[PDB]
Design a protein around this motif. Sequence first.
Motif, short mmCIF file in Angstrom:
data_model
loop_
_atom_site.label_atom_id
_atom_site.label_comp_id
_atom_site.label_asym_id
_atom_site.label_seq_id
_atom_site.Cartn_x
_atom_site.Cartn_y
_atom_site.Cartn_z
N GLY A 97 0.83 -1.19 0.00
CA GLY A 97 0.00 0.00 0.00
C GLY A 97 0.87 1.24 0.00
N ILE A 98 0.26 2.38 0.29
CA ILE A 98 0.97 3.65 0.29
C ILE A 98 0.63 4.47 1.53
CG2 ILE A 98 1.43 5.77 -0.99
CD1 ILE A 98 0.24 4.30 -3.48
N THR A 99 1.65 5.05 2.15
CA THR A 99 1.45 5.88 3.33
C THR A 99 1.66 7.35 2.95
OG1 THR A 99 2.22 4.18 4.90
CG2 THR A 99 2.30 6.48 5.63
N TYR A 100 0.74 8.20 3.38
CA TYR A 100 0.85 9.63 3.11
C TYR A 100 1.01 10.38 4.42
CZ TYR A 100 -0.79 8.63 -1.65
OH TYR A 100 -0.91 8.16 -2.94
N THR A 101 2.00 11.26 4.48
CA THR A 101 2.25 12.07 5.67
C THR A 101 1.93 13.52 5.31
OG1 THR A 101 4.02 10.58 6.41
CG2 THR A 101 3.96 12.80 7.36
N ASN A 102 0.88 14.07 5.91
CA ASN A 102 0.45 15.44 5.62
C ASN A 102 0.71 16.37 6.81
OD1 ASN A 102 -1.02 14.51 3.05
ND2 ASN A 102 -2.05 13.31 4.64
N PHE A 103 1.59 17.35 6.61
CA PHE A 103 1.97 18.30 7.66
C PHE A 103 1.18 19.61 7.68
CE2 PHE A 103 5.99 15.97 6.65
CZ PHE A 103 6.18 15.35 7.88
N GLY A 104 1.07 20.20 8.87
CA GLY A 104 0.39 21.48 9.01
C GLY A 104 -1.11 21.46 9.25
N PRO A 105 -1.73 22.64 9.39
CA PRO A 105 -1.09 23.96 9.34
C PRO A 105 -0.04 24.16 10.44
CG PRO A 105 -3.42 24.15 8.93
CD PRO A 105 -3.19 22.79 9.52
N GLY A 106 1.12 24.67 10.06
CA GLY A 106 2.18 24.91 11.03
C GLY A 106 3.35 25.64 10.40
N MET A 107 4.08 26.40 11.20
CA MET A 107 5.22 27.15 10.70
C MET A 107 6.42 26.26 10.40
SD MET A 107 7.67 29.95 12.49
CE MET A 107 9.07 28.85 12.70
N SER A 108 7.10 26.58 9.31
CA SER A 108 8.29 25.85 8.90
C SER A 108 9.49 26.74 9.18
CB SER A 108 8.23 25.51 7.42
OG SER A 108 9.50 25.05 6.97
N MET A 109 10.37 26.29 10.06
CA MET A 109 11.56 27.06 10.41
C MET A 109 12.43 27.32 9.18
SD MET A 109 12.98 28.66 12.82
CE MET A 109 14.52 29.55 12.95
N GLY A 152 15.51 43.25 2.48
CA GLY A 152 14.28 44.01 2.40
C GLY A 152 13.22 43.43 3.32
N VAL A 153 13.47 42.22 3.81
CA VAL A 153 12.55 41.54 4.71
C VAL A 153 13.00 41.73 6.15
CG1 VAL A 153 11.65 39.32 5.47
CG2 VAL A 153 11.91 39.79 3.03
N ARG A 154 12.19 42.44 6.93
CA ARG A 154 12.51 42.69 8.33
C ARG A 154 12.24 41.43 9.14
NH1 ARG A 154 8.82 46.97 11.18
NH2 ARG A 154 9.38 48.12 9.27
N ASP A 155 11.18 40.72 8.78
CA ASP A 155 10.81 39.49 9.47
C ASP A 155 9.74 38.79 8.65
OD1 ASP A 155 10.57 37.57 11.52
OD2 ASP A 155 9.06 38.74 12.59
N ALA A 156 9.56 37.49 8.89
CA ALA A 156 8.57 36.72 8.15
C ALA A 156 8.42 35.31 8.69
CB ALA A 156 8.94 36.68 6.67
N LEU A 157 7.37 34.64 8.25
CA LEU A 157 7.12 33.27 8.67
C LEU A 157 6.45 32.53 7.52
CD1 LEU A 157 3.98 32.36 9.35
CD2 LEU A 157 4.26 33.94 11.23
N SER A 158 6.83 31.28 7.32
CA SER A 158 6.26 30.47 6.25
C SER A 158 5.40 29.37 6.85
CB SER A 158 7.38 29.86 5.41
OG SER A 158 6.86 29.09 4.33
N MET A 159 4.12 29.37 6.50
CA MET A 159 3.19 28.36 7.01
C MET A 159 3.12 27.18 6.04
SD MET A 159 1.96 29.41 9.88
CE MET A 159 0.43 28.56 10.21
N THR A 160 3.25 25.97 6.58
CA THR A 160 3.16 24.76 5.76
C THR A 160 1.69 24.35 5.75
OG1 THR A 160 5.38 23.97 6.27
CG2 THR A 160 3.75 22.32 5.60
N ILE A 161 1.12 24.22 4.55
CA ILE A 161 -0.28 23.86 4.38
C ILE A 161 -0.43 22.52 3.67
CG2 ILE A 161 -2.51 24.61 3.51
CD1 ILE A 161 -1.31 26.51 5.55
N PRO A 162 -1.18 21.57 4.27
CA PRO A 162 -1.37 20.26 3.64
C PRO A 162 -2.37 20.34 2.48
CG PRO A 162 -2.72 20.38 5.56
CD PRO A 162 -1.85 21.63 5.58
N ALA A 163 -1.97 19.85 1.32
CA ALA A 163 -2.83 19.86 0.14
C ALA A 163 -3.39 18.46 -0.08
CB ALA A 163 -2.04 20.30 -1.08
N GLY A 164 -2.94 17.52 0.74
CA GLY A 164 -3.40 16.15 0.63
C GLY A 164 -2.42 15.28 -0.14
N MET A 165 -2.49 13.98 0.11
CA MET A 165 -1.63 13.01 -0.56
C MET A 165 -0.14 13.37 -0.50
SD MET A 165 -4.18 11.19 -1.19
CE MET A 165 -4.88 12.03 0.25
#
Lengths: 297, 297, 297, 297, 297, 297
Positions: free
Chosen positions: C138-150, C161-174
């Motif tokens: 079979g197949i195993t799928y690992t879906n992360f987030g919503p959560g910040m990615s360091m 030009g970027v003083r600060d920021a954060l990238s959110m990881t969003i699961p799209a499925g599969m």
Amino acid sequence: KLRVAVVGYGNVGRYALEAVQAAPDMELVGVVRRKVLAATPPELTGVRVVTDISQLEGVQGALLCVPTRSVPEYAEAMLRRGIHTVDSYDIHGDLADLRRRLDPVAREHGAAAVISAGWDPGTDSIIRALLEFMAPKGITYTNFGPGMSMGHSVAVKAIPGVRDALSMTIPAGMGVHKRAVYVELEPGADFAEVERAIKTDPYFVRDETRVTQVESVSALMDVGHGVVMERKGVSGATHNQLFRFEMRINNPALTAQVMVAALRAAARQKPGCYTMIEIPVIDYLPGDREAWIRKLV
Amino acid sequence: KLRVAVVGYGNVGRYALEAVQAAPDMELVGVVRRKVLAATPPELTGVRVVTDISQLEGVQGALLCVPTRSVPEYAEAMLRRGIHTVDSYDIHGDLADLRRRLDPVAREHGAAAVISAGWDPGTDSIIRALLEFMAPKGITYTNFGPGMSMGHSVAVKAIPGVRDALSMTIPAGMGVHKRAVYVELEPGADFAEVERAIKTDPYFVRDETRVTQVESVSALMDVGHGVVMERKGVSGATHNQLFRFEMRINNPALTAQVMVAALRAAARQKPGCYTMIEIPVIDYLPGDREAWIRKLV
Amino acid sequence: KLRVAVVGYGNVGRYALEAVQAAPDMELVGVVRRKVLAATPPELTGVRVVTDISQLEGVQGALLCVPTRSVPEYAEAMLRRGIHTVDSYDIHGDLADLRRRLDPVAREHGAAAVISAGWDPGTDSIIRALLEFMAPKGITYTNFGPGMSMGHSVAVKAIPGVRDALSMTIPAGMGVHKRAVYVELEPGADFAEVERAIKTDPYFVRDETRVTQVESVSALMDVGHGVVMERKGVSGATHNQLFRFEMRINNPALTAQVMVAALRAAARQKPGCYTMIEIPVIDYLPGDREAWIRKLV
Amino acid sequence: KLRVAVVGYGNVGRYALEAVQAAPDMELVGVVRRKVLAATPPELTGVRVVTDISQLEGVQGALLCVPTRSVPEYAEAMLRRGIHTVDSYDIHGDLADLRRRLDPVAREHGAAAVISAGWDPGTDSIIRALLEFMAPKGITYTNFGPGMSMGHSVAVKAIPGVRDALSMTIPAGMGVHKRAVYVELEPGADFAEVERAIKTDPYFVRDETRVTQVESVSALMDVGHGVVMERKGVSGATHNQLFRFEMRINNPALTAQVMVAALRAAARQKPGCYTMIEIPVIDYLPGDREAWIRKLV
Amino acid sequence: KLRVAVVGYGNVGRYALEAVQAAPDMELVGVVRRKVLAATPPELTGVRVVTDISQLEGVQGALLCVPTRSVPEYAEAMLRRGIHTVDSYDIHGDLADLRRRLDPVAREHGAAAVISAGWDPGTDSIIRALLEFMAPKGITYTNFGPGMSMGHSVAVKAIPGVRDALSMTIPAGMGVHKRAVYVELEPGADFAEVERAIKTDPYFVRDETRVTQVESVSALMDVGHGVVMERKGVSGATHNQLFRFEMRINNPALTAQVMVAALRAAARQKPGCYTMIEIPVIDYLPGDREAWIRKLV
Amino acid sequence: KLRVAVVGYGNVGRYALEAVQAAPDMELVGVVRRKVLAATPPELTGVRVVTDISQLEGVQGALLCVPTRSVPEYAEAMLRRGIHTVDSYDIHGDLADLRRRLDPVAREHGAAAVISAGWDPGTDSIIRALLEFMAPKGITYTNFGPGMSMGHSVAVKAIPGVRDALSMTIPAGMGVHKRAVYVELEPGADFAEVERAIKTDPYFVRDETRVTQVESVSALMDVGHGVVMERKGVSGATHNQLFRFEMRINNPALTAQVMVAALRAAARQKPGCYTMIEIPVIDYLPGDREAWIRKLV
């Protein structure tokens, strides 16, 4: 277009009116009801309302929107006139006997009757049949609510001291149900007494029941309801086939719409009496079969 | 008991064998297949296996467990013998034309044919019909997967350089689907080329497709599948009626079981060709109607 | 009790401090960090803080709470001192090579090192291993987030030009993920430019990415994260076995706690380097085995 | 390849056969069972079947697919022959004592025994251990079903008057379970009596139990089962970490597959007795460790 | 910035400290507690801690983080000093009376008091108010847990023989709750006795209660909690409007944060006492209204 | 009772009529609409209907059930007459400017205006405000649908060649939406052309859009809609606080009911203009505050 009459004017009735008016293959001849006041209700404006179906011209089918206990006699009365009938008789225990009783009456008068055509019995019955043949070995559970139960509510109202009441059906899982009753008492009535009368009533005695006194029951009334049907069974020799059907709907609105579809089907059957699982599903859809086969199959 | 033969021996076929053996109202006469080796497969021990249905005695019905493209000719061949047939022809686009083609053939030979009797088309078609008449105004969405698609998988395997492949159907919501393909390459084959051949194939070009090369496809193979059918519509004049049906099942196992139920129904119909929405649901259940009405309605 | 030191003081670090203090079988000797100011942080009150592990007495194990790129060198440095080590090195692509590199270093110095001991890699790795042997095909799928990615976040912060920021990881499925970036620009910085530099960065180019400019990123920062691991596979010859694991947790808090458990396990292993799937799960539990067997099995 | 024998032929047994045949690192030597009739069952066609393991050549490991009460003696008998053993002994209250009893027997005969290797005890035990060290402070709830309980079902059948029966385990939440029993009575048996004998039985007395009489129990039999394991705990000093694991599977199919994986692990352990939480998870996977580490961690 | 003091130092207190420190429009003057030892707690390092509010300079508002039974007296004491106050008084039955008692005290001293400002009562109260006017006819159910109940827990701790314990609130649905108690007994204490004293305590007698003895309660302690609020009602004359609000949070952390927001609002009100549904929601947000209107509306 | 007039008669209008008639503290004076034909609509039977509000006696408040672009002028016109107004203006980008424009007009004429009082903007705005102060650091996502978008649908109908059409709003997650358009073409119109005009329209260009041609759009029309609002944030210094609000409702029915509640609140405010987050929630409830506090807090 099938000439139809709405017999009985209550919840399902007002919803029955809308269901018929929205049908593309039906013509509403009028409404038959016990009371016709001079002050015509807003929604009945422009609609013929009479006390006897004989005063409606060329009615071919009738939606019996009357209390369950009144269905058998009403169905026989309309069938004996040669009018196709549909009802949502909801007593699972003897609807099979109702079918046996009405079958010869319908056939003898060249009409068709489709009984217990609501969502349960009715469309839920079809679903249960599908799950049954898709996985023959297993168990199906039908879980109702949260939603108001007419029967349970009436029983409570029949109790002296009760001005108004509402009985909520609560799913406990695995086909078991709990009852949450809300009661508005008459001036000077005793709550303890009423509470006992409720919890010990044969309609409640078998289920976990809780009673709460409220200032106003009408303020808590909502006709929404629902169901969760589940089956875990064996297809052939393969176990653990999982099935789930859920619905969150307006109770009387859906019932009336199914009755309309069932009457449409009735007009297409050989004379006799049928439950919804005895009619090919396409007969519930308006117009020629070809287009529906291409769209839905 | 209805004397039945399983024609074709593949996934649905082996599951077809189990479905028939588990049926209380059927007698398995035998299996018809292209190849009959001296080394009798374990599950076929004690089962008559031949290359032509004429070598099976008194067969009354046949489950056509052959590829979709082979169904039309096989159905006509069996019907011309006076044998009832059932298939799970899955091309929504022209199954209506298949029905038109087989109807006179079936009737002329005094047999009944039920086509597209799997879970989709098939039982899902019945469900879509129910949701359609319960709430006439609205939109129904059928979301498939996660599950393997035979058609998409075959297309990939037809590509030079591909030793084996598996195409997973992924629901994107609102009736849209994505494809996740896993491919095992032949020695020295080029992945980039194969990947292009896949993504640009007319069977994939319309959907978001992702391809991954794997050491072994058989290690990823599972025949489970599923569906989520949803509808938000108007019952009569009442909006927002919500319906949801979900299934998580063994694909070939369910298909075979539905085919069995459909063949049972076929034997009860007037000669001609039918889709599953043209048969009263109770005809899919074994034995007399009375008991089922009392149990399910 | 195992004498432990927390090496590196950041999120996982502060959380590492709490994890060690809460361990019943450990004694926190102190914290090693590169910055030790006169104004001792509140939570570090009463805690020995130094710039070199040599200034912490009798340290037996160390939690390497340093950036992923610094893990390999720190691990070797501590192992060469005979100190057991644990880290949450998160590069799936090369952690296997890290294992082979550290193995002889750990063994040669009589210590044990457990690498990639966070929740993924780490505990999720163990889960994936279980699902793999429970249903081999079979197949195993690992879906992360919503959560910040360091990693994704720091990459964006590297853009001028970027003083600060954060990238959110969003699961799209599969197993597919999308990125939602929020950026705070330096005075006079150009958004369009930054946006382009982000969407075209090798860390984002292959995923659907969206960028939004905000007045303050600190106001959007939350270290919560999650995962949904699913598998549909074959146990033996039985298909459609369904498995699902979900987690909604504080990222650094869980990582630090797992590291603590892994260090506990490290102290119990023969010298060498291990990933979390190479250690009996009971070794992650404090105290004698007997009690845990009776409690959990 | 590990030469394996399946001892005992029942549910888990038939599934045990398939699990072994599907294992890439095992060679099925044969099946040991109490009765070997002339009419060889179809699935056992081509498989050596005998009444004593001594009649199977060079067996190195054995899956003990016998009733729980028979496991202790069978394990000792096989271990005393130098054969590694695996069982799914499911009595949580005494398996720790079983471990202590078998440990010296296994070691003295140079063999390894892994006990209670099903999904619960077994894989669920590993999961509980993981949740425990990931969030040391909190509570884990294991909720079983809907699913048939072999033990409870056998207890019902042991009652005079019952022809057949099945006991469904129903999750009430928070680790509490209810029982739903379906019984098929012998000709002229009294239901009230049986119902009392059931609800009063020591295996049911502590749980809410409902009994229903049915025409046929085999028509309700499905071996699917499931579990929902949940934990809300503290990682370090951070509260409300949320974890959830759910499974919907074929009970005997999964149990047999886990047993196969556990036997594989057994062959890799030092002589003695182990529960599944005492074995590194990678030992449950076939072949070299390297590939699995790169693939799963 | 509003000069604030945290009065009382317990869970909500430590969380209160963090909530104030994180507020952009507040300045923490200090903490008032009855115990001030020489060994200043880590988190209180650099924070002024005294036994009387009079020793904190220019305090304008105070978070009353004291037991519910102590709230009325503390609120009056602070209000009589001209200090705005906020509390999370949680007795639904009498908070209305608390409001009438504190109203003239607050007004007379030119201060504002916002009572019952936790999540329930508090924010959940606002939600219930919204659902009430969005669908005036229907019923709202508030389901709590899984989560620890302070009151229930302390009540159990009052039972002699109990060294420590915690009571978990379990949602049974439809606003009904069950109790799961875990108790740690003093050496030589009798479980049966304690169990009886618990199940018969007025705080437990009316709910399904289960008691389990454990070796350590601190090992089971987690302050996470949650709620599921649902309503099915009529908007105007349209039935079956469905609403659902769920929360999984750290109990004391959220309570403290809401109290902070409520104190912010208090400083903006005319002198008097208010519940959270008596204050415009924008007053709970820091800074000018304009920006929030553009951001949130 | 507040004397109210419904201005504009459309979807929200018909529902507006019902909302007012169902309000216990309001008296419907009549309906103002552009056309008043001889054939009085059934629901307007017995209701005074005129073309100008001046022909309605003593109107104190008005529900502006007109298109968004007409709201500004209608609001000013009614306010200049000293009539309180409520609207559901739904342009998030400029409603703040609308507030500033109407504020002086309302105040100068001694009336109160509550703008953007639907469910979004409106009640959803209050919810977003609550989640914001409960967990100040984090991100809130508002996901709409499945549901019909009036604005998008009108844009499609404005295109030559389209007889009728409906645009469905589909949630893609994380606040992103997709559009599914169904169009009914005029006789001899070109689909490709229309499809391009749609996907290229400024109301669709930014979102993924799919267009399908249908025989009838009215057959797909349903006014149900919904939302899922989620926030993962920090309460104080405690991360991962989880919040979720979901609604499945009749769009115009809810909007009209909220408008009624907002008009009720308007009559209680000092003259000026307000958004729903600027009014104490209790002002949305009919009657004295005391009863609601005891009942809801």
